[PDB]
Copies of this chain bind each other. A is one copy, B any other.
Amino acid sequence: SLRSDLINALYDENQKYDVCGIISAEGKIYPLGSDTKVLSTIFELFSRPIINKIAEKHGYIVEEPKQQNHYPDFTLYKPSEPNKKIAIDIATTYTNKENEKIKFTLGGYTSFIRNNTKNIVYPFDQYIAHWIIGYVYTRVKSSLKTYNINELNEIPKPYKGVKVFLQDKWVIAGDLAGSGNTTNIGSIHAHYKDFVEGKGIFDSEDEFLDYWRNYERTSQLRNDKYNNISEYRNWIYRGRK
């Protein structure tokens, strides 16, 4: 499938290459900084041609948002089925020590999830799948000078334990918010193999959704409705009260 091949290929590409800098037309290279955003940006640019290569080997077109603040990074679809779109987002986190537990921010829970068309490239109901390509690395100077193409193997790299997975968003979604004032779904908090294997907390994609479409924006209010999965099934069990 498109899926087994995308992960095999991102997987393979990660094993074979190491981004070490950004380069200019003239050939001068500038090392990578350490802070998180440099790396999310980079893993994302890293994924892009791979995603496109596999997509067209299977015949799907790939459309990135033509506008900012719009989900998802990549919209895949066969013209044959415009209502079977596939959303692919990139999510990244770090580790201070290899193989420790991790969590990601999975996107807003108050735009397209509640409003079919807010901040999303196509209406929400035209997608049948929402995948997350997740990157995990261990955060790790000669990083402040520039280099030339002949010194590529000695440029210091801001990280080292890079791992990559591809999994359905509802599947690794957790029950606590991933951020506050920017209202993001939080993923589970767990080791890398738990993301690869699907050991999430929802029973289904409808439960993930119903949960996030009714979770209050603050602890205040979550006091009265529900604040985690157990309470939320108690509230459902009672009649949504």
Q: Contact residues of A with B, CB < 8 Å?
A: 16-38, 40-42, 44-46, 48-49, 52-53, 62, 64-65, 68, 144-146, 149, 152-153, 155, 157, 181-182
Contact = CB atoms under 8 A, between A and B. Distances in A.
A24 B17 contact: yes
Nearest to A52: B144
Given A30-B49, A146-B49, A24 B18 contact: yes
A26 B18 contact: yes
Contact of A152 (B22, B23, B52): B23
Contacts of A44: 33, 38
Give the interface centre of A24, A62, A182 by most chain B CB atoms within 10 Å.
A24
21 contacts: A17-B25, A18-B26, A19-B23, A19-B30, A21-B23, A21-B45, A22-B22, A22-B23, A22-B45, A23-B29, A25-B155, A25-B157, A26-B152, A34-B64, A37-B41, A38-B41, A41-B42, A49-B146, A53-B144, A62-B144, A181-B182
